[PDB]
Symmetry: C3
Subunit: 73 residues, 3 copies
């Protein structure tokens, strides 16, 4: 397998995650606007839930970036 493979797999996953993240962002915006219109505790809690969802994937992405940077140098 080796290095080029690693790279290619990593960048592949990178773009996949970004599209997930642009998707999740779409939902946040939707939620946020419902929020702004109709504030509510329970609505705050579904919103924070999506936020954490987003954070998880960002961290994943950063983990992948670090690996690419480590491999290339």
């Amino acid at each position: 397998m080796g290095t080029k493979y690693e790279l290619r797999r990593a960048l592949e996953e990178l773009e996949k995650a970004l599209q997930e993240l642009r998707e999740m962002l779409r939902k946040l915006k939707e939620s946020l606007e419902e929020l702004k219109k109709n504030p509510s505790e329970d609505a705050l809690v579904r919103n924070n839930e999506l936020i954490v969802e987003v954070l998880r994937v960002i961290v994943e992405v950063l983990s992948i970036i670090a690996r690419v940077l480590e491999i290339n140098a």
Copy 2:
């Protein structure tokens, strides 16, 4: 135009976005401390709003990072 240009433009935008993000972070901290002092539903909603704002820009930054990594390899 080509490759070096692309790179230079990308890194330029990268740093611009970071300063935006350090700026937005300043506002979050301010908001957060008002929050911690004076909890409130509506204050929670302005806070979550800034959070999403921050997330949008992070995703943008990551999109730019991916592109740089893709170009250099």
Copy 3:
């Protein structure tokens, strides 16, 4: 010192921050689930607090990534 040192220090800090971020994520998940079980304004405020905590470190990480990319080119 110079370039290789810079790189090595940067990647070192990168991984340190990621482990911090995976740690903070663990706490968010814990908090989030308490939230989902027991919604509350004050619980929302401790949650948003961890969120901002996470954001700070992400921004830091991105600052480090940018620097690596700038150095390597």
